[PDB]
Design a protein around this ligand. Structure first.
Ligand SMILES: O=[N+]([O-])c1ccc(O)cc1
Ligand SMILES: O=[N+]([O-])c1ccc(O)cc1
Ligand SMILES: [Zn+2]
Ligand SMILES: [Zn+2]
Ligand SMILES: [Zn+2]
Ligand SMILES: [Zn+2]
Lengths: 362, 362
């Protein structure tokens, strides 16, 4: 059975289980069940399923080289699908809440969930909470008897926490750290001294890479009972490397990809985000370019946004991206080679993840 | 050592652990650590600690009648305090997010967290997420070796989910169920046909009673390794009964308690909530009273709110509350008597919880 067919079939099964349980144990009525079905579909479906499918693909790689009864193969793949959906539902939680936090308009070509007329922010915040709860409901139901339950739950909650910490790093990335204070309204930085590679790397590591790469790779190992067979320090290092590249691509696309292809209007410049573009620009600009950037960044004024995009264009940041990408290729290939010492099979799964990420539509 | 002294000492210890771990494992800087310390204090401290202290008091009751080394008593009480703080931090998560959802102004005599000048909704939504994550970080750290870890985590996530489901029941309680639809803006009910005792009871059971009574009572049993010694069906029934009374008191206070004592301005009438007052009023009103209620409920117009408060006053709902309270006393005393068959000690702990709830400042 093709992996994507299995993954989509398991979504339907998990949805039916969750909704049936709301009826049998939580006293839900049919109209509220329908609302939640629609909310689940709208917030969880429509992406590429990169993260959830990585769990499945990692598991498939081990199945190809390990002796198992057919029923065991089916169990492992079903578990990989459920675990993959846990990650997709965790992402859905963060996207619902982030869109509210940021006042975003569109996501994946459609209005953000909170903007649906019959949702509103009042309901959407709580819908996002439900999405997160569903990750645990599905784990306890499907994995109750499994030897990996404890490790999987502990990993999951640490990754969730890291993501929340990363969201804090991201939301505060345009303020001066020494002025942070709940009592005092926060002005945007004027010096941009905290727009550095190391500070950018911290934001991305926590906000993106743990849930986007580390969690699917390690969950794939756990459902395969294979974690002891790899060097975990290498898994962490390769996840953090590929995850940073993924986010750099997203940062470039926010500025330069036409919104019809992006699925949204990117607002990183208006929001004063510490993006790869801003950090890299400030790492090559002359004093006059720095001053013009300071005079225009972080403002909704469309003429000021256009000045920033022109500064970026004239600064030939495409060349910096090419150099960055070439270095990532060197480093990822090196990490894949190291992974082969203890697990050639897992190394190939990572090679596949990297190729997918590298070839992701620019 | 007095129980409250121990509980407050454990807060300081847990806070230090969480913040130290953010520095050692999550790359946090000192200013963001200070923000989170202040956020923790502002959102988690200042209440009565009814819920967290119930874990401690349940554990103390078993210690008084069970043979243990002194070091074991200290471990159990420390565990009860940590578990109690998990509940307090879960509540803090829901209060942060609920205040945003509802546009609330004040909580416990101070501005709601999102209204602090240097917080804002963008940060506060995520701060609430962090509060929830901290409940799991503390459990995995302090309870890693404990036999009750699995049961406690599974209970906790089910209660969290129930609370989210109850929030959905509460937020939608003023709309007609058959019109719920994410695509269509939701009008307030005109018939109020869903303002019934059974529908009210469903809202309260899920939104309040699981986290306010069931979770502290059962967590106290788990940290005491005593759950097998009680009839759990009775624990559920007594939690749901006392929890409903707690919420009825809160509903009355929202309308009639001066805001200086309440700590906020109650807005249930303007928000069209399915409150005990509204349900009970509609259960005794004549046609003219129903019509005037319909003409004024659910509107910010202060003159319309005053009409509703006068309808409530003239309807002698104080007498309905007295009758409701007398029935709760009958039923809670009956459940405490039944609890004595298998656990006289736990029965006394419940009797203490009931007395505290019954005597809670009106
Ligand atoms: O972009 N990609 O191709 C991805 C992204 C995440 C992941 O876990 C695997 C592949
Ligand atoms: O109001 N009260 O006294 C309470 C409330 C909750 C609880 O778990 C114990 C006592
Ligand atoms: Zn964001
Ligand atoms: Zn982006
Ligand atoms: Zn509310
Ligand atoms: Zn209330």
């Amino acid at each position: 059975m093709a992996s994507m067919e299995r993954f989509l079939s398991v979504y339907d099964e998990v949805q039916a289980f969750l909704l049936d349980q709301l009826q049998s144990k939580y006293e839900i009525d049919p109209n509220r069940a329908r609302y939640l079905r629609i909310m689940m579909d709208t917030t969880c479906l429509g992406g590429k399923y990169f993260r959830g499918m990585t769990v499945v693909n990692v598991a498939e790689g081990f199945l190809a080289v390990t002796q198992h009864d057919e029923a065991t193969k089916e169990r492992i793949l079903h578990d990989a699908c459920v675990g993959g959906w846990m990650i997709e539902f965790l992402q859905a939680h963060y996207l619902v809440e982030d869109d509210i936090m940021d006042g975003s308009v569109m996501r994946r070509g459609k209005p953000c969930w909170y903007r649906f007329p019959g949702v509103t922010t009042q309901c959407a915040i709580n819908d996002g909470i439900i999405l997160k709860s569903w990750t645990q409901i599905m784990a306890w139901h499907y994995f109750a008897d499994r030897p990996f339950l404890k490790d999987l739950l502990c990993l999951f909650q640490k990754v969730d926490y890291a993501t929340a910490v990363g969201q804090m790093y991201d939301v505060t990335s345009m303020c001066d750290s020494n002025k942070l204070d709940p009592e005092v309204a926060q002005p945007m930085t004027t010096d941009f001294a905290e727009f550095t590679p190391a500070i950018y790397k911290r934001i991305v590591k926590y906000k993106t890479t743990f849930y986007t790469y580390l969690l699917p790779l390690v969950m794939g190992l756990l459902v395969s009972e294979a974690a002891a067979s790899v060097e975990m320090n290498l898994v962490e290092r390769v996840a953090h490397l590929i995850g940073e590249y993924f986010q750099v691509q997203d940062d470039v696309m926010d500025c330069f990809t036409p919104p019809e292809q992006l699925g949204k209007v990117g607002t990183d410049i208006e929001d004063a985000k510490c993006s790869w573009l801003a950090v890299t620009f400030l790492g090559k600009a002359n004093a006059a370019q720095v001053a013009e950037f300071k005079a225009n960044y972080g403002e909704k004024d469309p003429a000021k946004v256009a000045v920033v995009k022109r500064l970026y264009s004239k600064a030939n940041l495409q060349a910096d991206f090419a150099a960055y990408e070439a270095e990532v290729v060197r480093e990822v290939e090196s990490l894949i080679e190291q992974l082969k010492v203890k697990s050639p099979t897992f190394a190939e799964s990572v090679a596949v993840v990297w190729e997918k990420t590298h070839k992701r539509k620019k």
